[PDB]
Amino acid sequence: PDSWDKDVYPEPPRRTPAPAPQTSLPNPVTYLTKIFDLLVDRPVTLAREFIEQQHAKNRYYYYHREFRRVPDITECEEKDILCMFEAEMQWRRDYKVDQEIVNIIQERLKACQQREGESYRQNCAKELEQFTQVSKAFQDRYSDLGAHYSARKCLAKQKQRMLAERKAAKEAAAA
């Protein structure tokens, strides 16, 4: 189904076994599935075709909204309130997008754990690593800002981290 992008939400090829009946005893599962199909799926399918043709009779579109880039808080004057407002709004939108990125990675991790069955501790190591990386990035960017968070506080936290990194690297280089 084209309803979502397959690259964003990867799924393995879904290999499934074939039936190899070793006895002549007829199973109840196949008959139950056959009667379920005949009694449930067909009426649902016909209703969906009717609804889909009704929708196709009246086709109209809606669009995704694009947002231009604006100067961020690093290139805003100390007391210039208009550029601070624009930078703040941009930073808030980027924060929301980052939240949704972490959501997507977490959904990937959950789907992997459910799908892999009993070998999840091995077959989901890539997803676990990717979530670890995204979690580290998000935690560095946004954690400990507080309830009254803003772009200025995020910038100050980044600046303090960069000072610490520069000092540690300088000390290691000259040792």
């Binding site: 007391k79 208009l82 709004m89």
Partner: protein, 70 residues
């Protein structure tokens, strides 16, 4: 339909907030400037404010006063 009938686009609120922020930032700057100007005039007394009265010079009589040495 709800958005069409009752509400407005994001740009209207965005630009109105920009205008409101401009107005109120100007007001804050003017308030600080007023406090500083009032302090300076009251300390110095060289401005239009805090001008306390003095004796008028048109009251003095400039005429010989029955005695040469005033």
């Amino acid at each position: 339909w709800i958005a069409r009938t009752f509400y407005d686009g994001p740009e209207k609120n965005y630009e109105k907030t920009m205008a409101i922020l401009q107005i109120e930032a100007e007001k804050a700057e003017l308030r600080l400037k007023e406090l500083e100007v009032r302090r300076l005039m009251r300390a110095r007394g060289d401005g239009p404010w805090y001008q306390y009265p003095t004796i008028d010079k048109a009251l003095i009589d400039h005429s010989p006063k029955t005695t040469p040495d005033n």
